[PDB]
């Protein structure tokens, strides 16, 4: 009965393509002509964090815009104080390969995962005063690529066996599973209200999953290569994905199609991390040609450049008040760019 | 110097953490990383059993007289996007089986285990990250290949090959076909033929890693 099933599936995908061509009354680039250009964005490095002896893989800002976590290949999970360059914590890790790290919104727990297929959650406030293992989560058969804290109780994790999972840290079991991908799911980005989340994989398509219900709502396929990073827009209506074909694309949830494609003819390098600003006018993209670019999200023109690293930029983070931008790269330096007048 | 007492104590704690990280890096620096990338039917289980005497990455710590080797085993990855983590390894232990030219794949497509191994080795040699890294090739299961080669001629596996069914001749031809693949003068393929029961593998690995470290030192100093 596979023939009528494949024909029905092609008819449904034609119906969805027809609906997306019907909804496209006008583009975004046409209606932004009246809007004034942002202009030059002069940013300089304020602080430089040098506590790692190996390449840094990921980072995450705290909600107080004060502390930051960073994971390295040598097996260290260092929690920095970004203003006065003081090491607040240094967690020695069991597995040296750690590809992601997250900081709780309350500020109590720090998770980290990698090639060991186990998500290790550490507790920072104890009566002993020494950080220790608090929870170990092992229910995946692929490498753990990203994790983010919805709250202290529940953590959303993304693995390399084409799965995402909602975990309950107290009991230690999978609450619900998200199995809609066919490639390795590289990154996720939570909504601010923690209702939905987006997930980009290696099938060149991003999915919109629901936390509570646990079923995929929307599918976005406009990339010709693997998606590496994803960043949800602050108001709760759009998101942006970066891929290896030197393009990052801004997609809309309610329009159910892509809005804008940020690309450049001289750039032929991959995108490792994307992030928005506090208002959402500047799109920060960490390219593979040793420097980051500041794009204008409404005008689609290259506004600025952050060139301070010697090796490829692996991770990039913006605070909640949007005061400074921290960039980590494989040359073992965390550089905190900020802009003044 | 216009800092409070807590800030000074925090700076001293940061200096303590700096010294601890420095000592951990000095302990870590004296270790050699090896990548055991292989196929399922390769017989790499025999290799780790010979080196020694669990979904996550397996870690093996075996020490010779003066050098400590730390071997990493991964296991079911279609496109292996995690390969960038293993840039800093000094050598890749890449094992292929000699007995696999008969048995076809489970899919039953017109592909052979040897041809898949050649494609995988070609993908490793052409990889952007592995242009500097050298390969140590082990040809496992000599006994089974020696037995099977009398019954079956080496025609189905290599049509271009036109030679007599001799164990030494064909083994040399397979070694030449594997050495043909690289097009970079920086790396050298260290070929060695192994068996189910051997004890010289640790010696072979020690000599090859010693050669690779001396060659890396000479290339870093600008001499080689």
């Amino acid at each position: 009965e596979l023939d009528q099933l494949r024909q029905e599936a092609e008819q449904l995908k034609n119906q969805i393509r027809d609906a997306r061509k019907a909804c496209a009354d006008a583009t975004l680039s046409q209606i932004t002509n009246n809007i004034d250009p942002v202009g030059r964005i002069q940013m300089r490095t304020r602080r430089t964090l040098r506590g790692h002896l190996a390449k840094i893989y990921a980072m995450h800002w705290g909600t107080d815009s004060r502390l930051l976590v960073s994971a390295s290949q040598d097996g260290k999970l260092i929690i920095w104080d970004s203003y006065t360059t003081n090491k607040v914590h240094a967690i020695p890790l069991r597995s040296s390969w750690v590809m992601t790290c997250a900081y709780a919104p309350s500020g109590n727990y720090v998770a980290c995962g990698g090639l060991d297929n186990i998500c290790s959650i550490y507790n920072l406030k104890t009566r002993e005063g020494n950080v220790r293992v608090s929870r170990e989560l092992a229910g995946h058969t692929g490498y753990l690529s990203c994790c983010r804290f919805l709250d202290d109780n529940q953590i959303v994790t993304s693995s390399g066996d084409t799965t995402c999972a909602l975990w309950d840290i107290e009991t230690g079991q999978q609450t619900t599973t998200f199995t809609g991908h066919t490639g390795d799911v590289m990154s996720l980005s939570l909504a601010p209200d923690t209702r939905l989340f987006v997930s980009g994989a290696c099938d060149a398509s991003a999915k919109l999953w629901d936390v509570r219900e646990g079923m995929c709502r929307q599918t976005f396929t406009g990339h010709e290569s693997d998606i590496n990073a994803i960043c949800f827009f602050p108001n709760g209506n759009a998101f942006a994905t970066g891929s290896d074909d030197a393009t990052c694309r801004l997609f809309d949830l309610r329009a159910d199609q892509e809005l804008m494609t940020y690309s450049h003819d001289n750039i032929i390098c991959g995108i490792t991390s994307v992030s928005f600003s506090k208002s959402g006018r500047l799109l920060l993209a960490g390219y593979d040609d040793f420097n980051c670019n500041v794009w204008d999200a409404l005008k689609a023109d290259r506004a600025g450049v952050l060139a301070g690293h010697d090796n490829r930029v692996s991770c990039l983070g913006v605070t909640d008040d949007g005061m400074a931008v921290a960039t980590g790269s494989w040359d073992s330096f965390l550089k905190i760019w900020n802009g003044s007048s | 110097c216009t800092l409070s007492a807590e800030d000074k104590a925090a700076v001293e704690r940061s200096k303590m953490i700096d010294r601890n990280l420095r000592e951990d890096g000095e302990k870590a620096a004296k270790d050699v990383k090896l990548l055991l990338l292989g196929a399922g039917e390769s017989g790499k289980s025999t290799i780790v059993k010979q080196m020694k005497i669990t979904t996550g990455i397996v870690e093996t710590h075996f020490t010779f007289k003066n050098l400590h080797f730390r071997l990493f085993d991964v296991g079911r990855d279609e496109r292996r996007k995690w390969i960038h983590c293993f840039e800093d390894v000094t050598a890749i232990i890449f094992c292929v089986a000699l007995s696999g030219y008969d048995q076809v794949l489970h899919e039953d497509e017109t592909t052979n285990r040897m041809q898949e191994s050649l494609n995988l080795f070609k993908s490793i040699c052409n990889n952007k990250f592995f242009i500097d890294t050298s390969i140590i090739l082990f040809l496992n299961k000599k006994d089974l290949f020696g037995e099977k080669i009398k019954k079956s001629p080496l025609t189905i596996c290599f049509p271009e090959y036109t030679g007599p069914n001799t164990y030494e001749d064909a083994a040399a031809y397979i070694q030449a076909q594997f050495e043909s693949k690289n097009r970079s003068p920086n790396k050298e393929i260290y070929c060695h033929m192994t068996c189910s029961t051997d004890t010289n593998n640790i010696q072979v690995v020690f000599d090859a890693v010693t050669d690779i470290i001396i060659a890396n030192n000479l290339r870093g100093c600008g001499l080689y």
């Epitope: 004060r66 502390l67 104080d81 003081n86 607040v88 500020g107 009566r127 002993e128 005063g129 020494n130 | 216009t2 409070s4 007492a5 807590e6 800030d7 000074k8 104590a9 925090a10 001293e12 704690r13 303590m16």
Partner: single-chain antibody, 232 residues
């Protein structure tokens, strides 16, 4: 977490005494260590501090040159060699652990105490009210005052509020005048200007009877409050 003091007794003047502090149940080597002395009818008085890793040592002015603090990290033990003991040294000696980083809670654990019985530029801390008779269910507001402004340029105000219950160890209540200590119920609160501070109790209970101390932690040597006892 356990700190056990030993080495006390009754001595003649001029004699020496090696005090020990036995630590268990925590990471001793990551914590700086404090000796604090309380006289029988007087308030708490700081003695000494040794940093984690023994790199940095601080003594009081009166105490300087006669007492030697040291620590043995593998044995998890704090030592205090005392020489030239005068009559003023007769006191209850407390061993204290303290860690200093952003967000930490220093002075969060107080020892049991050992008994010794012998036969200008410094910031002055002033609690002009020595005692207040209280009744349960009311709301209390006790004040403290410092001779120097305790607001630092980084925004922190280094003021700590302690409770010493009668016949028990001191207990931390408020650290840095804006943070509630671990295990303390949320009925306590702190509020102050640069020079005048106020600890406010809402719906005082039975266990709130004791002596309240204020403390500046702006600069060494540490100087403590005179103490405010709550009468029933």
């Amino acid at each position: 977490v356990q700190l056990v003091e030993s080495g006390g007794g009754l001595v003649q003047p001029g004699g020496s005494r090696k005090l020990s502090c036995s630590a268990s149940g925590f990471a001793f080597s990551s914590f700086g260590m404090h000796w604090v002395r309380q006289a029988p009818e007087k308030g708490l008085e700081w003695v000494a501090y040794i940093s984690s890793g023994s790199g940095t040592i601080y003594y009081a002015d009166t105490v300087k040159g006669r007492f030697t603090i040291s620590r043995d990290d593998p044995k998890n033990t704090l030592f205090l060699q005392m020489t030239s003991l005068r009559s003023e040294d007769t006191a209850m000696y407390y061993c204290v652990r303290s860690i200093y980083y952003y967000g930490s809670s220093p002075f969060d654990f107080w020892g049991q105490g050992t008994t010794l019985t012998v036969s200008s530029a410094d910031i002055v801390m002033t609690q002009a009210t020595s005692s207040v008779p209280v009744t349960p269910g009311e709301s209390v507001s006790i004040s403290c005052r410092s001779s120097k402004s305790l607001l630092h340029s980084n925004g922190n105000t280094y003021l700590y509020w302690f409770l010493q219950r009668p016949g028990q160890s001191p207990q931390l209540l408020i650290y840095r005048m804006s943070n509630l200590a671990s295990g303390v119920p949320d009925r306590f609160s702190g509020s102050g200007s640069g020079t005048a501070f106020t600890l406010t109790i809402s719906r005082l209970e039975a266990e709130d009877v004791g002596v309240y101390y204020c403390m500046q932690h702006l600069e060494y040597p540490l100087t403590f409050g005179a103490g405010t006892k709550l009468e029933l």
